[PDB]
Amino acid sequence: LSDPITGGHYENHNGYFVYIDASGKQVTGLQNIDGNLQYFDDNGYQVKGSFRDVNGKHIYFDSVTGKASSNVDIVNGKAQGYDAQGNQLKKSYVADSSGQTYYFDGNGQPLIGLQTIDGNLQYFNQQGVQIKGGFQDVNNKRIYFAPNTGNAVANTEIINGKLQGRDANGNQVKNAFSKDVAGNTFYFDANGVMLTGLQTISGKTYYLDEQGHLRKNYAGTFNNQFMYFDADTGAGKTAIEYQFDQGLVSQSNENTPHNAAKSYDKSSFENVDGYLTADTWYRPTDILKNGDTWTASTETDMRPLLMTWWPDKQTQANYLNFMSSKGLGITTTYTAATSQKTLNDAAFVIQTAIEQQISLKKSTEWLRDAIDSFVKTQANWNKQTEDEAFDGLQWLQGGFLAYQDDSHRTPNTDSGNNRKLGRQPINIDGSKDTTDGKGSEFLLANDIDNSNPIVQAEQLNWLHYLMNFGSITGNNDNANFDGIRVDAVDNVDADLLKIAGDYFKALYGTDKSDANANKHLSILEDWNGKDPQYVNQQGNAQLTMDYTVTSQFGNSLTHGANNRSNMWYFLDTGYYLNGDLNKKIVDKNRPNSGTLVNRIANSGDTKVIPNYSFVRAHDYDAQDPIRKAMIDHGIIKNMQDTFTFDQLAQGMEFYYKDQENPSGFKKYNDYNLPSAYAMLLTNKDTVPRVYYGDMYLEGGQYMEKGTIYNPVISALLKARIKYVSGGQTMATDSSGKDLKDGETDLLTSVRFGKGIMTSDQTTTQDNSQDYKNQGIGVIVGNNPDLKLNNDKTITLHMGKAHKNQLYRALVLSNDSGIDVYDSDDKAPTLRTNDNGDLIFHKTNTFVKQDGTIINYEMKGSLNALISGYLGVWVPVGASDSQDARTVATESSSSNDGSVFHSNAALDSNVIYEGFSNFQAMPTSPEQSTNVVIATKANLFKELGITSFELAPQYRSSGDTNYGGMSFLDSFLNNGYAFTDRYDLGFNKADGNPNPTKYGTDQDLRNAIEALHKNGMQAIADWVPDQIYALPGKEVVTATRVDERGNQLKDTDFVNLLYVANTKSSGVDYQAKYGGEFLDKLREEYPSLFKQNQVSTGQPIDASTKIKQWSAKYMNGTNILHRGAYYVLKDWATNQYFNIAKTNEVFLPLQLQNKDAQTGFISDASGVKYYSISGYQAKDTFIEDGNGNWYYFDKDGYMVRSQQGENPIRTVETSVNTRNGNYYFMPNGVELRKGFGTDNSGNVYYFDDQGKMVRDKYINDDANNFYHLNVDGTMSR
């Protein structure tokens, strides 16, 4: 078309769109801009909803977007179609602007009148337009043409007051069935009139309702005698003949004793916890070697269970067809309807063929693969029976199973009546279990049961191990973590917070002083908006996040190119009564809203909740954008998709390109990060956190390349050390959502200096002078097109403690970037007036302190570093070593019981979240994150970082995947997905190095020590919620559940046996260090082990140590794609097969060389059924080979309706999920997806699975609507 361009903004002049190039020139002519083909006339305006001529092409452009697309133009006298590229179309349909459709022929001229195209009959008016959705008299016949295709079809219309029928050829219908567009069938008699009621035609009987609709899959007593109307044609059957095609037959024959199991135990059967699986192999008594001679079987000989046994005929038939297709015999189309004897014979010819290819290949691995493949074919043995879903946290991995306490079937998996789910802080006592306030306990992988006292003790052991990691693993008391981040707070039992808090109190006396508390900085990933108040009621043992400020950054600065919330919203004026800033009366009662810490006039007089805050995180505004970028460039299709590191690297190049785009527009990345950091880093009453990926690029190697934002943020950080202290004020040139004439919505944030708490305070109460050269002024806008009125002035009230003082810029935005001034001499100055205000105008002339005059406009700007305004000002004359921080006090400041306190000392800290989930793997040992951190500790000391949040150091579970969806944490090795919780990079046992993504354990201890040498703390990521890729299998009892552990509403997956991967190796570091430190700890601090936890009423339990994980300590798992009935079960009795103990064996009778009879058999009392394994069906539903369903009562007899009696029966089965009301016909067949009449004439409806439906509306494929009352009946 025309070669594509990017990096140019769109501008609107006088109602018209212009496009200005990266070059800076206005664009004319046809242009492909970013994949969109557009045109601009001679004046540079864009064309929409009109045709233009370029080269040989006649191109229309859209009326909304202005994008090139197909249309019809009247050219001279005549209609002619055109495509998106401007070519006259031939032999094609085109729809015009009005949505009208023409078909243009070989010559490009539109067809008129009746026409057949792709074998479809269609009509066109005299102007060439296609008739759709209407009748039409053409060729002495009337024809209806369909709504969208416009194809001829049968339809009905009402002539006079009588419905009439019209066929596809336009002839009226007489003596026949004919449809209407909606989908309803009618019958019309010799006189053309529609028929009603019960009608016999061509020796068959049909039921037409009052409306004349033919009813299919409809049961009722029509001749005062039962009659079921066919699902195919609506033809009435008496439903007296049994439809099952399988009589009772014996299966035993000359091969039975050969194929029977050698033994009824674990020797001869591959199993899990005694149970069998679809891909179990077993040891037959004898082997048909080579297909010739039966020979006794050696222990090594093992054969697939599916060679000899099947759960049902459907599966048997499928096995036969599948194996046939692979060259093992006559390729066959077998069904469940095929006779049992035939299938069994065919299984033997396949068995023969199998033994021949075993001799030929001298291997069975080919067969292993064949069985594996086949098994996953079957819905009962794959995810189709697992109800994969993606809403809520299920988005991550496809859905969850909750494990159940079931001592009878699965006792190793019993949790001892633990597994309290969703005990998040707001629901720690279970009191919100029935609402959405129940915690989303399930997040990823195998969710650990942290409601179990034994597990709680283990988590404390782990915690201790981390806090003493260096002492324990290197006898280095300087290589120990100082504090923690609690991952996924709302997805675990909130007791863990108390356990961790109390541990720190006991060992470090954090409740004694601010100095103790602050030596072990600790944070929470606590997303719920009610968590801050909880955390505070519990004494702030770890710092809550402050999402309210992170959120407002999103709305007002960080997110979106244009429509952004005003900066006004940062104030939260509602904090005060009637939004009054003159009167400032605090509103003691509010509707649970507002920002955590008010900063309109924060003098430190009101107590506020201590907190950390951030602009971005490893897991906030990173993972989504980075993937959107890969998706957008075709590198992956879905967010959940698996990607390789090279795929990530390619995506990262687009991400970086977008981030640094000089246009200033950002598609994936965040806007105004500098401006956001300026606010974050000047705010009172918070510990700010800085994201590695805003300082360095999120991909590639650790600290490989700084970001464009690095200079500005680094300046802000160093200035925070020098100038940030004392009280705060914050104001905006704005009163709400909407702006008056002069109003700019520019935010002004001020800090005063050390002892200065207010605007009008002129001096410290202790008469210290530190304040005079401290304080800072920040101005920020969110409007890049901001232009001030000439009169307008914008003021920073630096305070009456700073009268007549000279101030100089730290940071100033402009149209190409943001200038950064490193010292007083290189920057513009400006002096405050008598009242202490720095006044700014549209136009400013600043003077350098010595050098020269500078010109500067208060102007919104647009470039890679900003979309809006940013100005930061500091007092000149600041000392080189000036430090405005407050040291933490050793005195017992407070008797409130609390650990952390928001004050000037706490505010003097800065956390650095020093990693990105999307870092590349180290190309060399020297560039490993923790090696680099050691060489660079210096650099962070000088940015004022007091605590370094390191990535989780645990060994990645990597590419390992036992079933179900892998997560990016795992395949990107970021440390959040791990197999061994105590392996932080130890060498292989053979001696070889084995680093994590971040380096060896020595590298970690060196990195931690380096940080202590530079006065910084090291934070351990405590990840108690889950663990990945456990190599041992167990059989659990599982229910399908949503993130909160609530059973999905319409699932049959309830209390079913499942093979899960829940058991640890037992030889891993978890085995070495598991529970080891608890005995020492109980001796030294008894009360930790005697104090009760809230959720359990119990204290933690160190009487049992966890060296090996297993299912009994888990709440559940993400679905593993194995199937609801991968654990094999007999349909007839519903018992699962087992061989664990010889006293309680259950196997199919074939395998024990007994006679297995299978099929339906009538007796005087009724019909009975025997399964393939030879057991009688009792209290179970059974499906025959033709697809009909039946219910067998407790007595062993099929349920069936009698004459004159109600066919509807209430069923209560062993399998609870099937409980409900069913409609069984005289031949026992259950009615499904259709209406059934009872003996008294009432109509009910029965769903996909046979169940009665109550209390709802129901729609029909033909658009008929019916209503079912509560008692089930149909009002309609």
Ligand X SMILES: OC[C@H]1O[C@H](OC[C@H]2O[C@H](O)[C@H](O)[C@@H](O)[C@@H]2O)[C@H](O)[C@@H](O)[C@@H]1O
Contacting positions for a copy of itself (CB under 8 A): 12-17, 48-50, 63-64, 75-77, 97-99, 126, 137, 139-140, 146-149, 174-177, 183, 185, 190, 202-204, 230, 232-233, 235, 321, 335-336, 378-379, 384, 388, 390-391, 395, 562-563, 638-639, 1261
CB of 558 to a copy of itself, least distance (A): 17
| CA 1224 from centroid of its chain's CA atoms | 42
Cβ 494 to ligand X, closest distance in Å?
24
Which is closer to ligand X, CB of 173 or CB of 950? 173
Which amino acid is residue 462, in one-letter code? W
Q: How many CB atoms lie within 10 A of CB 214?
A: 21
State the amino acid at position 100 in one-letter form. Q
- What SS3 class is residue 550? helix
What is the smallest separation between the CB atom of 222 and a copy of itself, expressed in angstroms? 18
Which of 691, 559, 689, 708 minimizes the C-alpha distance to 625? 559
Give the separation between CA 379 and CA 158, rounded to whole angstroms. 48
Residue selected from 447, 526, 531, 572 as contacting Ca ion according to rule CB under 5 A? 447
Nearest to 1181 by CA among 1151, 1227, 1212, 1136: 1212
525 in a known ligand binding site:
no
Which pair of tokens denotes residue 73?
């133009």
Q: Which is nearer to ligand X, 413 or 595 (CB)?
A: 595
According to CB under 6 A, which one of 329, 539, 574, 736 is a site residue for ligand X? Answer: 574
Of Ca ion, a copy of itself, ligand X, none, which one does residue 551 interact with (CB within 5 to 8 Å by kind)?
Answer: ligand X
Q: How far is the CB of 843 from a copy of itself (least distance, A)?
A: 27
Find which of ligand X, Ca ion, a copy of itself, none residue 1008 binds, CB within 5 to 8 Å per kind: none
Q: How far is the CB of 612 from a copy of itself (least distance, A)?
A: 28
Residue 71 half-sphere exposure toward CB, CA atoms < 13 A: 20
Q: Of the two residues 393 and 545, which places its CB atom closer to a copy of itself in the complex?
A: 393
Give me the least distance between CB of 1276 and a copy of itself, in Å please: 23
Residue 420: is it exposed, middle or buried by C-beta count within 10 angstroms (0-12/13-18/19+)? Answer: buried
User: Considering CB under 6 A, how many residues would be counted as binding ligand X?
Assistant: 21
Task: Using the rule CB under 6 A, give the single segment among 93-101, 158-166, 686-694, 1069-1077 that binds ligand X.
Answer: 93-101
Q: Is 53 annotated as a binding residue?
A: no
> Which tokens go with 255?
């091969």
Task: Decide which of ligand X, Ca ion, a copy of itself, none touches 843; Cβ closer than 5 to 8 Å per partner kind.
Answer: none
The residue among 178 and 1026 lying less far from Ca ion, judged by its C-beta, is 1026
1025 is in an annotated binding site: yes
555 touches ligand X (CB under 6 A): yes
Rounded (10°) angle between helices 929-941 and 1001-1013? 0
Residue 704 CA to residue 936 CA, distance in Å, equals 13
Residue 595 site contact among a copy of itself, Ca ion, ligand X, none (CB < 5 to 8 Å, cut-off depends on kind): ligand X
DSSP assigned state of 718: H
Establish if 1025 lies at the interface with Ca ion (CB under 5 A).
yes
Q: What angle do CA 489, 492, 496 make, to 5 degrees?
A: 80
CB 1053 within 8 A of CB 1038: yes
| Closest to a copy of itself by CB, 190 or 853 | 190
- The position carrying tokens 């074939």 is 1150
Structure tokens at 257: 């004793």
Among candidate residues 159, 201, 152, the one with its CA nearest the CA of residue 176: 201
The reply on whether position 397 binds Ca ion by CB under 5 A is no
Which of a copy of itself, ligand X, Ca ion, none lies near 235, with the C-beta cut-off 5 to 8 A by kind? a copy of itself
d(CA 361, CA 370): 14
Q: How far is the CB of 182 from ligand X (least distance, A)?
A: 10
Q: Which is nearer to ligand X, 33 or 597 (CB)?
A: 597
Nearest CA to 416 out of 462, 459, 449, 446 is that of: 449
| Interhelix angle 340-361/313-323, nearest 10 degrees | 40
The item of Ca ion, a copy of itself, ligand X, none sharing an interface with residue 491, based on CB under 5 to 8 Å by kind, is: Ca ion
491 counts as binding Ca ion under rule CB under 5 A: yes
Q: Which long-range contacts (CB under 8 A, 24 or more apart) does 194-197 make?
A: 194/156, 194/162, 194/163, 194/164, 194/165
How, if at all, do strands 483-486 and 523-524 pair? Answer: parallel
- Residue 587 or residue 883: which is nearer to ligand X going by CB? 587
Contacts of 498 (CB under 8 A, 6+ apart): 538, 541, 1093, 1094
Site residues (CB under 6 A) for ligand X, limited to 117-146:
130, 146
Q: How far is the CB of 447 from Ca ion (least distance, A)?
A: 4
Nearer to Ca ion, 421 or 541 (CB): 421
Query: Considering the rule CB under 6 A, would residue 99 count as an interface residue with ligand X?
Result: yes
Instruction: Indicate whether 1130 belongs to the interface with Ca ion (CB under 5 A).
Output: no
CA angle 417, 421, 423 (to 5 degrees): 115
Pick the closer one to a copy of itself by CB: 15 or 897.
Answer: 15
Residue 151 or residue 221: which is nearer to ligand X going by CB? 151
Strand stretches in 618-732, DSSP E: 687-691, 728-732
Residue number, 487 or 572, with CB nearest to Ca ion: 487
Does 509 sit near ligand X (CB under 6 A)?
A: no
Q: Name the amino acid, one letter, at 679.
A: M
Write the burial class of residue 127 (CB in 10 Å: 0-12 exposed, 13-18 middle, 19+ buried): exposed
- Write the DSSP assignment of 449-481 as a string of letters: -TTSHHHHHHHHHHHHHHHTHHHHHHS-TTS--
Least separation in angstroms between residue 969's CB and Ca ion is 15
Q: Residue 160 to residues 164, 172, 195, 695: CA-CA distances in angstroms? A: 9, 15, 16, 80
Q: Which two tokens stand for residue 116?
A: 């057949």
Residue 95 interacting entry, from a copy of itself, Ca ion, ligand X, none, C-beta within 5 to 8 Å by type: ligand X
CA R_g for the chain: 38
- Min dist CB 675 to ligand X, Å, is 16
Which CB atom, from 570 or from 614, has the smaller least distance to ligand X? 570
1106: phi > 0 → left, psi -120 to 50 → alpha, else beta; which? beta
The set of residues, in sequence order, having a beta carbon less than 8 Å from that of 293 and lying 6+ positions away, is none
Indicate which of a copy of itself, ligand X, Ca ion, none lies near residue 13 (CB less than 5 to 8 Å, by partner kind).
a copy of itself
Does 286 show up as a binding residue in the annotation? Answer: no
Distance from chain centroid for Cα 295? 55
Decide which of Ca ion, a copy of itself, ligand X, none touches 574; Cβ closer than 5 to 8 Å per partner kind. Answer: ligand X
Residues 581-620 contacting ligand X, CB under 6 A? 593-595
CA 1197 to mean position of chain CA atoms: 47
Tell me the window of 187-195, 551-559, 913-921, 1178-1186 that interacts with ligand X (CB under 6 A): 551-559
Backbone angles phi, psi at 1070, to 5 degrees: -50, -30
Shorter beta-carbon distance to Ca ion: residue 491 or 1039: 491
Residue nearer to a copy of itself on the CB measure, 198 or 248: 198
> x-or-dash pattern for Ca ion, window 402-441, by CB under 5 A?
---------------------------------------x
In the list ligand X, Ca ion, a copy of itself, none, the entry touching 130 (Cβ below 5 to 8 angstroms by class) is ligand X
Q: How far is the CB of 598 from ligand X (least distance, A)?
A: 9
Helix, strand or coil, per DSSP, at residue 143 = strand
* Residue that is written with structure tokens 């229309």 in the block: 60
Partner from Ca ion, a copy of itself, ligand X, none binding residue 63, C-beta < 5-8 Å depending on class: a copy of itself
Interacting residues toward ligand X by CB under 6 A? 93, 95, 99, 101, 130, 146, 148-150, 548, 551-552, 555, 565, 569-570, 572, 574, 593-595
Interacting residues toward Ca ion by CB under 5 A? 441, 447, 491-492, 1025
Give the residue numbers of the binding site for Ca(2+): 441, 447, 491, 1025
